[PDB]
Design a protein around this nucleic acid. Structure first.
Ligand SMILES: O=P([O-])(O)O
Length: 1095
DNA sequence: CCAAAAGAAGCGGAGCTTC
């Protein structure tokens, strides 16, 4: 334990004594950290890190010598060295600002003088930096090594933080602002997606600083300092970047939006460098020079990423051996630049790509204000995508004269729900633009004869890319549809691309040609198809055509189908057999493919079936109120309004109601993820208003093209057949909007009743500022909920099966109950330890617990089975990082601002997360994992969770293995896994130890709404034990269903497109049988097996 | 609705209070 002497020898002049017992000023930096047994950072021991790294970066020779490496990244050339020299000079500026802020802090309120006299200011939430200062005459100054190293981390963070940020969805934004996701104003999510909250910025910053300091945390040091000191430094650096304008701080006032919320939220945006800044070609020089084992870097050639030991943001969960194997397999895949697309992108240019794939140049006065904000969000995603791609290309180009020959590797990690996610924000897996320029797919085809198997594969790839639903028709039929398109509407674009793959030039109207030829088929992969077809046309040796064009073996209604196969636990029913066939599970039809099923057996997929069940359910609701004209009218107005702006809603001339599968796609999807009815109503309403806000921009653009244009023939001109026909459409719109915002349906004892809101909506509409706000959005929502979503949910349940719904409810209840106990017990164990610490003179409130004390508290929860094991995957549903456990500030900057709450890794309630976790995890998660590690695992693919991109040369075998992988995941039993964990929990849990708050939460999950109020600890305990039994029975059934189904002859083509189904070779033949007959035989096998168990 | 959480700032030196 000579560590004390060691760290003191490195920082012998820091203020205070490294002894938590000493009476005077104690130095918590020396108490909190220790030198690593093996060097982690090259700045440790350095007296002037900035000067030393600046010199290291001054020349390639000096760099190589500093990083003790014979060679250096070729991208580190002259122009780049020059940018870094300038950035280093800027680091001196940030350091100078930091030194002055400290000086100010020391002067104000005589803090420094008081600190010198013994006031323990180095323990205050805003004075932890005083732990890295040194006495200087009558004042104090930063230890230059710690300060400059932190500024270097600040520089690296400034360069690449933005590209490592997570994407914020509605849910996220709602959490931050506290505003109901359904009411989130327009563009709010965009403003918050392009920025970083305080927690977000400081957190990532503190991580970098601590890593660059290169020390290790002392397990017996208070988190208040081990985590607080690096965080305090980060807060000061963020403040310094605000002063230097490297970062813009924007305090968003929620009261301006929702006048009831008083939250004011800080948003931090890093100032972007010019897209053409040389530093973009090599933004990680500092990182790679400072750290022994750099984190941020590209992996070229044979430089492969290491394999992550723990699940993403879940340190407590280790990646299983099979998961690690999968990660290794995916990281070994070599990706390569497709020069043709890169050249095409570069020639079209950023502006035209935005015009073609974004919103082009939008002038804020020809567009609705809300619509505008949406278009701006669209442009951003594509633009950042474009710039990221070319910064990558700039670095690849330096690795060789032929960029198409430089192998690129990507790091991956397993997420909380078992998905193999490629690290980074804009990469082949996450960004469509990048996916068509950097591919792992490659094949050499013989396209000299259009009758070759190779040409057919090529056709399949082209058709799928061009939006031909290749999995719904046979290969032969798709071949004809593709030909028709290539020879017809696409011909003009094809000709242009031919010219491009000859002279390298594009017409001035390239965007119009493409846009016209593609229509709604437009996408980045569609551009790849046009490019690849045109390259083939001009190809010299069509006998050996090399192309990365791919075919995606794509899951058909994957999530829902997986849930149905994994969690249906009763006897087999004919409706289930017919419905599961829609997902590629064919019983008694050897070698049957999805292509044949859709063309000769059933043309309706699971979405269509849901939509059709919705129509039935909707019809029933109308009958129950057949006599109530007010209701009938409210329903007609809702349907009228949707048919007015949504493609999937058609109202026939004679009133015939038609709904297209599209309307059910997301609702079904998220309903399988545990979503509630209100959330679905909210999304449907948003898709309506978005169409409306856009139609307002269609109007503004109508008046500019002709001032004397009737509102009717300006808003519905293109959607009408005349001016009178447009007048009646406008009548509908105005009618519906007023009725749907002034009147809303209410649930009063099972019956629906209309009530005025008093907040009706009407008046001269201004196509410029038109907006449906709060109370009116709420009304549209209430109408959507009861007249459309309610029946939709009934339709969904009827389609996926009530048995599956029952299973998901028990799963949700079990995992929720368990998470409540984990959360509560953990907080109490913490509370007891703190009350125990308050009796310790060395300890101070604000200091928290040590990592060892936290590790102990977590270990003590093991008997409650916090982890769910499957044998190949581990799930920690309750796991999280929240501020509710410590409930205090960790640190602030020296201006008493940027107060970062102390977050701790600890269990928190699960809510409904148990459903997504287990369904995604044992479903598509396990399948991809299996696909990456199974015998003969397909090579050179790009896996995207529920679909996989395959090179045209291996489409048949890779897709058959994919279907085999699906079959393998269908042998899983997530309920059984939950059961095993829950049963251990039930035999060690003590409900009497739970706070009244926790015990009530449990009552909600385990008890009927009519038994909470007076529920005794012994009551809810017996109710919880009932769920264990429910789970055990569900799991037993699932286990039998899987065994029995495996005895029958099955053709599996869930990962459809190619027509290569996996055959399980079941011995029992169920061919020439109706679904009713098959269900009878399967149930016979079931009842038979049931006895085997009983005996 | 899962994928990662999540207010700011005076006064005083924590944590209550006001917007
Ligand atoms: O083109 P897909 O969606 O049928 O695979």
């Amino acid at each position: 334990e000579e560590l004390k002497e060691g760290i003191d020898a490195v920082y012998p002049s820091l203020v205070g004594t490294a002894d938590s017992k000493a009476e005077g000023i104690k130095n918590y930096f020396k108490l909190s950290f220790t030198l690593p047994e093996e060097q982690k950072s090259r700045t440790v021991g350095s007296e002037a890190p900035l000067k030393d790294v600046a010199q290291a970066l001054s020349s390639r020779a000096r760099y190589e010598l500093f990083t003790e490496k014979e060679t250096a990244n070729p991208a580190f050339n002259g122009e780049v060295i020059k940018r870094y020299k300038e950035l280093m000079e800027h680091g001196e500026g940030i350091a100078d600002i930091l030194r002055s802020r400290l000086a100010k802090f020391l002067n104000t309120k005589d803090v420094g003088k008081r600190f010198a006299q013994g006031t323990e200011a180095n323990r205050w939430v805003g004075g932890k930096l005083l732990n890295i200062v040194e006495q200087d005459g009558d004042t104090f100054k930063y230890n230059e090594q710690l300060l400059q190293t932190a500024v270097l981390a600040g520089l690296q963070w400034r360069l690449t933080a933005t590209s490592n940020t997570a994407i914020k969805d509605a849910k996220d934004v709602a959490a931050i602002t506290g505003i109901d996701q359904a009411l989130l104003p327009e563009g709010l999510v965009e403003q918050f997606d392009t920025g970083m909250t305080l927690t977000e910025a400081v957190s990532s910053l503190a991580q970098k600083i601590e890593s660059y300091w290169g020390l290790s945390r002392n397990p017996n040091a208070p988190l208040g300092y081990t985590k607080g000191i690096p965080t305090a430094m980060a807060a000061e650096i963020l403040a310094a970047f605000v002063e230097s304008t490297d970062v813009v701080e924007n305090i968003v006032d929620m009261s301006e939006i929702d006048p009831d919320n008083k939250k004011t939220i800080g948003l931090y945006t890093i100032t972007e460098l010019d897209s053409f800044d040389p530093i973009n070609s090599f933004p990680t020089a500092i990182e790679e020079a400072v750290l022994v084992n750099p984190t941020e870097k590209m992996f070229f050639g044979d430089d492969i990423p290491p394999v992550a030991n723990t699940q993403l943001r879940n340190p407590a969960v280790r990646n299983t051996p099979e998961q690690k194997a999968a990660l290794k397999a995916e990281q070994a895949t070599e990706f390569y630049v497709h020069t043709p697309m890169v050249q095409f992108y570069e020639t079209l240019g950023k502006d035209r790509i935005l015009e073609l794939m974004g919103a082009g140049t939008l002038n804020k006065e020809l567009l609705n204000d809300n619509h505008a904000k949406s278009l701006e969000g669209k442009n951003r995603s594509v633009e950042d995508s474009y710039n990221q791609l070319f910064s990558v290309i700039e670095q690849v180009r330096a690795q060789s004269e032929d960029i198409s020959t430089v192998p690129i590797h990507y790091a991956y990690n397993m997420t909380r729900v078992g998905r193999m996610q490629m690290l980074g924000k804009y990469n082949p897996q996450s960004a469509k633009l990048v996916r068509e320029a950097i591919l792992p797919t490659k094949a050499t085809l013989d396209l000299s004869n259009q009758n070759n198997e190779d040409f057919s594969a090529f056709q399949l790839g082209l058709a799928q890319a061009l939006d031909i639903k290749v999995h719904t028709m046979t290969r032969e039929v798709m071949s004809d549809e593709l030909t028709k398109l290539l020879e017809g509407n696409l011909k003009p674009a094809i000709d242009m691309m031919v010219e491009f793959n000859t002279t390298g030039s594009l017409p001035e109207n390239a965007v119009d040609v493409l846009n016209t030829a593609l229509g709604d088929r437009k996408s980045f992969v569609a551009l790849m198809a046009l490019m690849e077809y045109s390259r083939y046309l001009v190809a010299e040796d069509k006998s050996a055509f090399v192309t990365p064009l791919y075919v995606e073996a794509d899951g058909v209604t994957n999530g829902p189908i997986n849930a149905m196969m994994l969690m249906t636990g009763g006897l087999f029913t004919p409706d289930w057999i017919r419905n599961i066939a829609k997902g590629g599970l064919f019983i008694g039809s050897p070698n049957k493919t999805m292509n044949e099923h859709r063309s000769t057996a059933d043309n309706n997929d699971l979405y269509q079936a849901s939509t059709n069940a919705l129509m039935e359910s909707l019809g029933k609701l109308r009958s129950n109120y057949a006599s109530n004209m007010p209701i009938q009218s409210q329903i007609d107005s809702l349907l009228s309004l949707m048919d007015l702006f949504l493609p999937d809603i058609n109202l026939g001339e004679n009133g015939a109601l038609e709904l297209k599968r599209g309307i059910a796609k997301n609702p079904l999807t998220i309903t399988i993820y545990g979503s509630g009815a209100r959330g679905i109503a909210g999304k449907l309403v948003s898709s309506v208003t978005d169409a409306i806000y856009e139609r307002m921009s269609d109007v503004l653009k109508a008046r500019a093209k002709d001032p004397n244009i009737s509102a009717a023939m300006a808003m519905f001109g293109k959607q009408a057949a005349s001016e009178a026909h447009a007048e009646e459409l406008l009548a509908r719109f105005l009618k519906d909007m007023e009725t749907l915002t002034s009147t809303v349906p209410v649930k009063r004892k099972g019956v629906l009743e209309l009530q005025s809101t008093g907040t009706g909506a009407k008046g001269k509409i201004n196509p410029k500022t038109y907006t449906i706000k709060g109370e009116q959005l709420k009304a549209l929502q209430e109408n959507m909920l009861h007249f459309f979503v309610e029946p939709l949910r009934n339709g969904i349940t009827q389609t996926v099966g009530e048995s599956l719904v029952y299973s998901t409810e028990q799963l949700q209840k079990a995992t929720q109950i368990q998470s409540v106990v984990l959360e509560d017990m953990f907080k109490q164990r913490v509370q007891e330890k703190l009350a125990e610490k308050a009796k310790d003179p060395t300890w101070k409130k604000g200091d928290f617990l040590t990592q060892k004390e936290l590790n102990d508290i977590q270990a003590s929860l093991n008997n409650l089975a916090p982890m769910i094991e499957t044998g190949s995957q581990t799930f920690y549903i309750a796991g999280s990082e929240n501020a509710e456990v410590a409930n205090q500030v960790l640190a602030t900057n020296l201006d008493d601002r940027m107060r970062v709450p102390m977050s701790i890794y600890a269990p928190a309630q699960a809510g409904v997360a148990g459903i997504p976790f287990m369904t995604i995890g044992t479903g598509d998660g396990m399948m991809m994992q299996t696909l990456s590690t199974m015998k003969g695992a397909p090579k050179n693919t790009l896996k995207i969770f529920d679909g996989m991109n395959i090179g045209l040369n291996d489409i048949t075998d890779a897709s058959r293995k994919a279907n085999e992988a699906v079959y393998t995941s269908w042998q899983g039993n997530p309920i059984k896994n939950v059961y095993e964990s829950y049963a251990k929990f039930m035999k060690n849990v003590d409900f009497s130890k739970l706070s009244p708050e926790a015990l009530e939460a449990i009552g909600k999950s385990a008890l009927e709404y009519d038994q909470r109020e007076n529920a005794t600890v012994d009551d809810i305990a017996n109710a919880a034990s009932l769920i264990e039994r429910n789970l055990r029975n569900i799991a037993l059934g699932v286990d039998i269903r899987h065994k029995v189904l495996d005895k029958v002859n099955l053709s599996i083509d869930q990962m459809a497109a190619v027509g290569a189904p996996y055959q399980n070779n079941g011995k029992i033949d169920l061919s020439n049988m109706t679904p009713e007959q098959q269900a009878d035989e399967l149930n016979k096998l079931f009842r038979e097996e049931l006895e085997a168990r009983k005996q």
